Structures are given as C-alpha cells and as structure tokens.
Design a protein around this ligand. Structure first.
Ligand code: HEC
Ligand code: HEM
Ligand code: HEM
Lengths: 370, 158, 74, 237, 98, 47, 56
C-alpha cells in the first residue's frame, strides 16, 4: 500500500481556471527524466580523459547506431529545459506564486544547482569554449581577497585547468540531477500542504477538481509540443544554439576573438561584464539571482496576482525586455554602443524589482483604499 | 451486517460507509430508468461508487450461477408478497392494462424467469450498464463526488 | 489534504453534460476568433511597447556599432 | 569580419539531401590536394561505404597507402597497406612539423571545421574564391596572402586550388568552381554522416506529430468539454 | 483631478468584467481568514457564486456581457468593517504584549 | 583573461610592448611577471 | 454507420481493444516507411545510392 501517496498525481484537488502555462510546471519532470535518460545512455561512450574525450564524442556521432541523435536530444534538450524555467518562474511573478515562501526558496536552490550543473556540462567535450568557458567564470572566484586564489586552485586541481579539472566535474555533473530528482519531490511536498495557485491569485478552494483525465493529458499535450520543439531543432537546426566553436579541439595557447558562454548565462554574464571593477559586479551576479529569495518581502499589494494589477504588467513585461536585452547584449562584445546599455540595463534589472513593483501595491492599495 | 450476501451490503455494514441505499427499475413506454439511490456521508462517496461500479462490471462479465438463483428466488417472493390483498392486485391490473396490453399471469412470470441463466445476464448488463452514458444527481455535501468522466472511466472494467 | 473538509458551500447548482453528447470543437472559428481578439486587445498595450523599444534598441545597437568600425576622415 | 552570403545548395532545403555524385568527385580532391597538409583524423575509408564508394573500390585506396601498424615480434614497428578500419593517412606526425613545413602557421583539421566556423560551407566556398590582388596601402610578409573572408584578411594560405589543377574520374570540368562545390559538399558530410538519415526522421516526425497533435488536442477538448460547457446558478431563499 | 482615475483604473483591472468585486480579489492571510470566517451566511454565500463563475470563465478566457459587468458606484465596501476590526485586535494583541 | 598575441590582447586590442608593458587598451596593468631565478646564463627556474 | 459497427466489434471490450492496435500498427508500420522513403526518393531523385547502384 504505497498506492495512497500516488494520489497526489491522480486524485489531487487542483483548480479549474488553469491556463496552458502550467504545462511547463511538469515538463521539467519530462525534461529531467528524458535528459537523464539520454545522458545516461550517452555516457556509455564518454571518456573522462583529455587525450580522448573530444574524440570519444566523435566515437558517438559517427560510429554508433543512431547514437548521434543522443548528443542533441540531450544538449539542445538542455536549452528547451531552460526555456521552461524562465517561462515557469516569471509566471510566479505574473501570478504571485512567490507568496509560498517555503516553496519559492526551493525554486531557487534548483536554479543554482542547475546553472552550476550545466556549467559543468558544456565543458566535457573540450570545445575551445569549454576550456575558456570554464576559465573565465571560475577565474572570477579569485576576486575574493585571501581565499580566492585558494579555492580556485583547489578546484582546478593544480594551478590551471587540466585533466584533473575534467573528471572532477563529470562526477559532479552526472550526479546532481538525481539530487534534483529528490528535491523535485521536496518541491512538491511543501506544495502538497497548500496546493497550486491560480492566475487570479484567489484561494480557489471551492473549485478544486480531479487530475487524472484533465491535467494529465493536458501536460502530455505540452510534452508533445516539447518533443516537437525538441525534435525540430535536433533534426533541422542542431547547430543553432550550441556554438560552432565547441567542435574545435581544446588548446590553451589560442583563444577565439569573441568569447561567450552558452546563450542562457548571457542575461547574467552581461551584468558582470558591465562592471569595469572585478568584485563590484560579482556580488551583483548572485544577488541578481538570489534577489528571488528577497522578493517575497516585497509583496506590497494585498492582492496577489497581476491580471488584476494593470500597472504591474507595464513593469513586468518591461523586465523581460531587460533580460532578453542582456541576453543579446551579453553575447556581443565590449564596445561603446553596448557598454552604454549594460551600465543601464543592469541597473534597470535591480531597479524594476526593488523600487517599482513594490511602489505599485503601495499605490494600487491607495487607488482602491486599503 | 457482515454476514449478508450482497457484497456491497456487507462492506457497507463492515466499514459503515453509507447509511442506506436502494435500487429500482422504472418502466416507461419506449424507455425506463435503471440505477440506484444511495445515502452516505461526505467522506465516503467515492468508495461506494467504486464498489458499486465494481458490482455492475462483475455481472457484465463474471456472474456465478448460484448467485443468480439467489435473485431468481428473491423476485418470486417479491411479486407474490407484493400481491398480498386486493389493492396491490389492481395496481398491477390497472397498470399492465395500459403498458403490456394483457395481464400476465404469475405462472407466466415464472416461466420467463426459468429461462434465465448467467448467459443472459452477461448479455443484458453488457447492453445497458457497460460503457453507456449514465445520468447522475446529488443534493448535499458532495465535495467528494467525482466527475462524470471519472465515473464513466470507472464504468468499464479494464 | 483532499476533498471533503475544505470549506463551506450553500445554495449552488451545477449542470453539466457528457462529452459524448456534444461535439468537441463547436463554434471554434465562429466564436473563438473574436474572443482571441478580445483577449488580444486587453494585453497588447502592456506587452508590446517593451518589445517595440527592444526592436529599436536592437536596431540602433547595430547601426552605431556598424558605423564605429567604419573609418573616419583622417 | 565579413559575412558570406547564403549560397544555395542541393541540400539547403529542410528535406533536401546531398548529391552523392558530387561527393564522389569531392573525395578525389582531398587526396590529391588537401591531404598533403590537412590532418583529418576522425574519419576512415569505411564511412565512405553507402555514400560515394563501395567496399572493394574504397578498399583499393587502403591498399594504395602505407600505414604504420603492428609491433613486430622483434619488438619493432613497420608499415603495411591500410584497410577499411584504418583512418585517413595523417600528413604529418605532429602539429609542430606542420608549422615547420609552413611559414610558422598551422593547418587546422577539416573534420568538423564546417560546423566550427560561422556560415560553414558558404564561408569556405567563398574563401577559396575570394582571392584577389591586395588593395592599395597594404603590406604582407612572405608566405602570407590576402583573402577578405579570413579574419584579419591576412593568412599563410598558399593558393591550393586553380583551374585545371587536376582531373576527375567521369570527366566533368576541373574548374576552380565545380571543384569548390564538391569539396564543400564533402566537408559537410564530414561533420554530418547522418544527413541522409536526419531528414528521414526529419520527415517521419512531422506526419506523426502533425497527425497526433490534433488528436490529442481533441482528446483534451473531449474531456474538458464537460467544463467548456458547464452552467451554474444561485438559489437561496 | 482625481476621482475620474479611480473609476478608470477600476475598469482597467478587468475584474468588473468577471462579475467580481473589490474585496473578492484580496490576498489571504491569517488576519483575513478570521474576517471571512466572521461573515454572515446571506453575504458569505453571495461571495462564492461571484467567485465560482469568474473561475469558470477564466478557464474559457471568457467574460460576461456588458450589462452584467460591475459598476464602480456599486463596488460596495462590505468587508472593510469586519477587517479593520481584526487589526484593531491585532495591534492590541502585540503592543499589550510589549 | 585571454591570450595576447606577440607583436597584444586580440579580443580587446590592447597594445603591448615586446616587454609586455601596456601602451593602449582596456588592460589595466602591465602583464603578470612571475617570480623566477636563473641558475646560469642558459637555464631558468620559472617560479 | 461504419463508426457504430466498428464499436460493437472491437473498441467495446478491452481485451479486444489492444488487439486491434498492435495488429493495425503492424500493418501500419509496413506502409509508413514505404510512404516516406519513396517520397524521400521522389524529392532527391538522381542523388542517392540506389540511383547509382547500377553503374557499379
Ligand atoms: C599548401 C598546404 C595546404 C593546402 C594544399 C591546403 N591548405 Fe588549407 N591551410 C593550410 C595552412 C598552412 C593554413 C593556415 C591558415 C592560417 O594559419 O591562418 C590553412 C587553413 C585552412 C583552413 C582554415 C580556415 C579557417 O576558417 O580557419 C581551411 C578551412 C582550409 N585551409 C581548407 C583547405 C582547402 C579547402 C583546401 C583546398 C581548396 C586546402 N585547405 C588546401 C595549408 C594548406
Ligand atoms: C540539468 C542537467 C544537465 C545539464 C544542464 C547538462 C548540460 C550539458 C550540455 C549542455 C551538454 C552539451 C555538450 C555538447 O552538446 O557537446 C552536455 C554534455 C554531456 N552530458 Fe550533460 N547535462 C545535464 C545532465 C547530464 C546527465 C543527467 C548526464 C548523464 C546521465 C550527462 C552527461 C553528459 C555527457 C557525458 C556529456 C558529453 C556529451 C557532449 O559533450 O556532447 N549530463 N551536458
Ligand atoms: C526540476 C525542477 C522543477 C520541477 C520538477 C518542478 C516541479 C513543479 C511542478 C510539477 C509544479 C506544479 C505545476 C504548476 O504549479 O504549474 C511546480 C510549481 C511551482 N514551481 Fe516548480 N519545478 C521545478 C523548478 C522550479 C523552479 C526553478 C522554481 C523557481 C522559482 C519553481 C517554483 C515553483 C513554484 C513557486 C511553484 C508553485 C506553483 C503555484 O504557485 O501555482 N519550480 N513545480
């Protein structure tokens, strides 16, 4: 009788005014299992040695029976993964998930678990952006005084990246999804005491309904769109996001003229690149992420959602401009027309969050007298 | 209580799920209504239906001959004991003489029943219970009351 | 938590029908399309103008960058 | 930088494949021209099977070239005629020899160079066919040459290709252009031995997912139809 | 001038198009759960049917016709008396404990 | 943190000397001199 | 109709239900590959092996 715990996925109360957005809330369960499933079969032929790893990728894409697909179902799968999140998370702001303080913090620790995971996943094939993609980011932790040189050398397994740096990631990288796999259940546990959170933001206790016919197939419909949007890229444009350079062998004695990590850092990497100072931007980086833990002390409106806060929508979709800007501005080099942007866009990010969204509810309460 | 014959009834006495239920068979000209009426508390509705459908599908598929003889010998004592006096007799007459045409003698009601066996039931229940489009109602704390879709998905075994 | 002890309800009626007794997609074109537009007219004004500027800042971001690499008269 | 154009191809279409006849002449080029200084290490003759050559025919090329294999029972190594399992003959044993054979410059590998350079083919085809006289006010060391598509517009690329530099089997024209077509067709196959099959699943996917997606979208709308048509009321005293 | 804006902003929220009121859209904390629990049946039940139908329309993304919409002048403040009553007890509950 | 080229930070175009001292560029400092010692006129101990 | 007569025979009983699927799927497999490949040949005529599989 472990059949009573699996009612949360069968006979669970949940609302009925639910959009197609919340497909994304469960696709991660499909991305994660699929991605794990892919990568697991994928690591059947990976090798954790410098002299053969890049070749060991080529062992797949050429000589394995239909294994060449698996490099891309996994790799570009990781892009479709992140496409869910920043459609999964900005949701919680546009609807007000973040009041569930016990859950929202969990939603952070995943992100830093992943964004530090994925950083270890782009590096395995020794692409000439693997190396420098690991150098630059990891080099920053030298920014700290009196310990930065230690932990960095300590993680590099020496004084610079090498074979010893590789294997230490491959185990740290093959493992965390399982740590995520259990934290996923935790993320659903604190939910289970309270359930979901409609777009309106209203406690919809009166209109909670079953789950096996309705949202199951609805999620499957979303999974179809995911598999579609995943099968499309791998079949029609696998070179799109995965940068071309990463097919190059590794060589420390030469750099590309232009550096950029994978596209998804770029909203965050640009924030640091804006700051000419070294340390003065690093603390802004994690602060830009860890601000999410700091938002729920800024729920000024005694409403919840933003479907019923029109001014919030004016700001919220403006935030997306900044991220999608820093995304692009990050992936482009350091020159005068672009530095002028990030010096503003970085400030705009912190500004929209900590000044104007609070300012709204302080006003909107006054616009309607409470 | 527990010792009863209807497996539905025994469970209802076992765990005290419900307080009362009844069945029926209405007859109208080209149609009727087959179903049941049951009465329970708001923390027991789903299970009764799961058991209730659990009986219909059982008879659609797996109907023990001895259990048929139970009901064949229930129905005899029904119509007879129903006919205890004169007023019940004229209920049947004044009703049959607008529905069936003739009156049916009781020796004829018996001969029809004696033709019955489990082969018949598995055809009939398959025709009118199985996978059909039922009709539901509810007046009370029906907070546990599942949706018509789930109810229909519970209608066909497997 | 589950059904049964959530809250209170009084004097409420619910009517509903089987799926089989109704087409899946009735009035999809006939009634949906205005509702799409109505859904549109309530959201575009608070969604687009950010992306409008983005398209421009994406434009001027290239042109000024395009000119800077082109030489000066000297 | 310089952005190459989007030259069409026999395979640019999202259900277009490679002209294997074009590949067949393309492989001639790498052996006659590029295999003197380009080290394609991630390929073997066997992968050409089902693509441009056959088993026995391509094997005739493995018999052609000597390969260093086999510890002799004496404890030494030797040379043999290669086979289909053997990867291509590496020109030079190490990178440094290639730098020494050139004006300090290195030839890159050409296995995955297409997918490791923006534009891929269109870069390469216009690279060879972008040679011209240097402009006024430019100076270059010996060994270096001019080509606008290369970054810095300065390269130690000796001109490898020219009209009537060799001849091909069936006898098509050995122009600087047609040769430049087959070779870029050839290299795309290098970093994509799956093109013939990617589109096949490229097509099977659509006529399934395009066919399922309505049906699931109906089964959705099927179940939800109870609530897409649900009415209420409010009848207290 | 002000008062034209409260009427205006009240139309841009949209919840007057789903047959709802001002009070219905409030965020729920322990301070308000008491107040809701304190409400009378004649009015409390009238809360739910307002909410219950707006949900069913949010499912469809539909709304009500223009006649059924809510007017600003009828945006009754039925809940504020019960509410501020509570916080009058909250602040007494705390400062007295100080 | 990239590789300057000799006779020069390419990804930012930072003009250095043959000695490696910055003349022009975003590079704030002249480059890193490590500690070392010459055992002789033909050998080195870099560190 | 065809729809109704189909129902009583196959989609009624569950043990019969899965029988139709794998059977039809088997017969469906034989057709879908033949549909795609010929079209893939129809597009890229004069490019594939089987169109040069006679010269050698
Ligand atoms: C004479 C020896 C030699 C021949 C023959 C030769 N290459 Fe090169 N190749 C080189 C060298 C040396 C470089 C180094 C370029 C540099 O250092 O910038 C190079 C560079 C390249 C590159 C690098 C382009 C890039 O974006 O980095 C490609 C691609 C290339 N060759 C392809 C070819 C092709 C195509 C041909 C035949 C048309 C060919 N090679 C024939 C020696 C050769
Ligand atoms: C959230 C989890 C993960 C992320 C974000 C991630 C990230 C990545 C990415 C982006 C690549 C692309 C490399 C390329 O395209 O060349 C990659 C490669 C790889 N992944 Fe991970 N990965 C994850 C989980 C896993 C898992 C679960 C496994 C094994 C079960 C795995 C094993 C590998 C291996 C062996 C490679 C090398 C293949 C290659 O580089 O092409 N990864 N990883
Ligand atoms: C592998 C990673 C994750 C898994 C498996 C997962 C799983 C889920 C699921 C199944 C839901 C319910 C669907 C829904 O609410 O629409 C949910 C909701 C939620 N998730 Fe995720 N999630 C993940 C990542 C995240 C992240 C990165 C955040 C960042 C904030 C987050 C925050 C939330 C919140 C706040 C909710 C509440 C939903 C509501 O308020 O209605 N989750 N999560």
């Amino acid at each position: 009788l472990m059949k009573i715990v699996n009612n949360a996925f069968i006979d669970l109360p949940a609302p009925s005014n639910i959009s197609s957005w919340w497909n994304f809330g469960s696709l991660l369960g499909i991305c994660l299992i699929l991605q794990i499933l892919t990568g697991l079969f994928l690591a059947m032929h990976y090798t954790s040695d410098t002299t053969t790893a890049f070749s060991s990728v080529t062992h797949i894409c050429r000589d394995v029976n239909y294994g060449w697909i698996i490099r891309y179902m996994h790799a570009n799968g990781a892009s479709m993964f992140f496409i869910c999140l920043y459609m999964h998370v900005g949701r919680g702001l546009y609807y007000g998930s973040y009041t569930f303080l016990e859950t929202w913090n969990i939603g952070v620790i995943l992100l830093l678990t992943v964004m530090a995971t994925a950083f270890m996943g782009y590096v395995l094939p020794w692409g000439q952006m693997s190396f420098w993609g690991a150098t630059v980011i990891t080099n920053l932790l030298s920014a700290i005084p009196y310990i930065g040189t230690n932990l960095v050398e300590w993680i590099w397994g020496g004084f610079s990246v090498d074979k010893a740096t590789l294997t230490r990631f491959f185990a740290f990288h093959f493992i965390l999804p399982f740590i995520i796999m259990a934290i996923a259940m935790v993320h659903l546990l604190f939910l289970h005491e309270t359930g979901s959170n409609n777009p309106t933001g209203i406690s919809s206790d009166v209109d909670k309904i079953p789950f096996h016919p309705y949202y199951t197939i609805k999620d499957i419909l979303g999974a179809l769109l995911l598999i579609l949007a995943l099968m499309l890229l791998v079949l029609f444009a696998p070179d799109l996001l995965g940068d071309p350079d990463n097919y190059t062998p590794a060589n420390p004695l030469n750099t590309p003229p232009h550096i950029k990590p994978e596209w998804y850092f770029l909203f965050a990497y640009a924030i640091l690149r804006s700051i000419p100072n070294k340390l003065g931007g690093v603390l802004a980086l994690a602060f830009s992420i860890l601000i999410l833990a700091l938002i729920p002390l800024l729920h000024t409106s005694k409403q919840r959602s933003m479907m019923f806060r029109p001014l919030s929508q004016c700001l919220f979709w403006a935030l997306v401009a900044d991220l999608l800007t820093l995304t692009w501005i990050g992936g482009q080099p350091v020159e005068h027309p672009y530095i002028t942007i990030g010096q503003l866009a970085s400030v705009l990010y912190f500004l929209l969050i900590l000044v104007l969204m609070p300012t709204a509810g302080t006003i909107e309460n006054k616009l309607l007298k409470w | 209580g527990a010792h009863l014959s209807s497996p539905l009834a025994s469970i209802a006495a076992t765990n005290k799920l419900c307080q009362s239920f009844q069945t029926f068979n209405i007859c109208y000209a080209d149609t009727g209504l087959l179903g049941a009426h049951f009465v329970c508390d708001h923390m027991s509705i789903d299970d009764m239906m799961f058991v209730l459908q659990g009986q219909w599908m059982r008879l659609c598929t797996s109907a023990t001959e001895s259990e048929v003889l139970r009901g064949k010998n229930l129905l005899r004592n029904a119509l007879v004991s129903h006919l205890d006096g004169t007023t019940p007799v004229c209920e049947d007459i004044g009703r049959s003489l607008l529905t069936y045409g003739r009156r049916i003698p009781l020796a004829e009601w018996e001969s029809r029943i004696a033709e019955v066996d489990a082969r018949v039931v598995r055809e009939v229940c398959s025709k009118y219970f199985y996978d059909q489009c039922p009709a539901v109602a509810g007046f009370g704390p029906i907070e546990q009351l599942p949706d018509y879709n789930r109810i229909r998905s519970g209608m066909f075994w497997l | 938590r589950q059904f049964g002890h959530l809250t209170r309800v009084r004097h409420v009626i619910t009517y509903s029908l089987s799926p089989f007794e109704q087409r899946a997609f009735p009035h999809y074109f006939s009634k949906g399309i205005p509702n799409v537009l109505r859904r549109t007219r309530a959201c575009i004004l608070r969604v687009a103008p950010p992306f409008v500027a983005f398209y421009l800042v994406y434009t001027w971001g290239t042109q000024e960058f395009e000119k800077s690499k082109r030489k000066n008269p000297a | 930088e310089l952005h190459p154009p989007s030259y069409p191809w026999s395979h640019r279409g999202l259900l277009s494949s490679l002209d294997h006849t074009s590949i067949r002449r393309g492989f001639q080029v790498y052996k006659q021209v590029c295999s003197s200084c380009h080290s394609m290490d991630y390929v073997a003759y066997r992968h050409l099977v089902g693509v441009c050559y056959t088993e026995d025919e391509a094997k005739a090329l493995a018999e052609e070239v000597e390969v260093q294999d086999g510890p002799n029972e004496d404890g030494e190594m030797f040379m043999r005629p290669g086979k289909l399992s053997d990867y291509f003959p590496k020109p030079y044993p190490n990178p440094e020899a290639a730098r020494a054979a050139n004006n300090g410059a290195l030839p890159p590998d050409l296995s995955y160079i297409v997918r490791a350079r923006h534009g891929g083919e269109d870069y390469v085809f216009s690279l060879l066919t972008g040679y011209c006289e240097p402009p006024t006010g430019v100076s270059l060391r010996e060994g270096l040459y001019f080509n606008p598509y290369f970054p810095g517009q300065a390269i130690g690329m000796a001109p490898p290709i020219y009209n009537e530099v060799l001849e091909f089997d069936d006898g098509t024209p050995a122009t600087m252009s047609q040769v430049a077509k087959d070779v870029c067709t050839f290299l795309r196959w290098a970093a994509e031995p799956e093109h013939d099959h990617r589109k096949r699943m490229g097509l099977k996917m659509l006529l399934m997912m395009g066919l399922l997606l309505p049906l699931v979208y109906a089964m959705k709308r099927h179940k939800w139809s109870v609530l897409k048509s649900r009415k209420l009321a409010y009848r207290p005293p | 001038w002000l008062e034209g804006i409260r009427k205006w902003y009240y139309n841009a929220a949209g919840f007057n198009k789903l047959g709802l009121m001002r009070d219905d859209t409030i965020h729920e904390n322990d301070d308000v759960k008491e107040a809701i629990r304190r409400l009378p049946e004649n009015l409390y039940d009238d809360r739910v049917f307002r909410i219950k139908r707006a949900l069913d329309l949010s499912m469809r993304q539909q709304i009500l016709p223009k006649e059924q919409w809510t007017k600003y002048e009828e945006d009754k403040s039925y809940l504020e008396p019960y509410l501020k009553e509570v916080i009058r007890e909250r602040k007494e509950r705390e400062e007295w404990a100080k | 943190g990239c590789v300057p080229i000799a006779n020069y930070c390419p990804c930012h175009g930072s003009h250095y000397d043959a000695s490696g001292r910055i003349r022009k560029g975003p590079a704030p400092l002249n480059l890193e001199v490590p500690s070392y010692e010459f055992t002789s006129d033909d050998m080195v101990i870099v560190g | 109709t065809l729809t109704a007569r189909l129902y009583s025979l196959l989609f009624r009983r569950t043990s019969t239900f899965a029988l139709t699927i794998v059977v039809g799927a088997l017969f469906f497999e034989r057709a879908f590959d033949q549909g795609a490949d010929a079209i893939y040949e129809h597009i890229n005529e004069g490019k594939l092996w089987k169109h040069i599989k006679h010269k050698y």
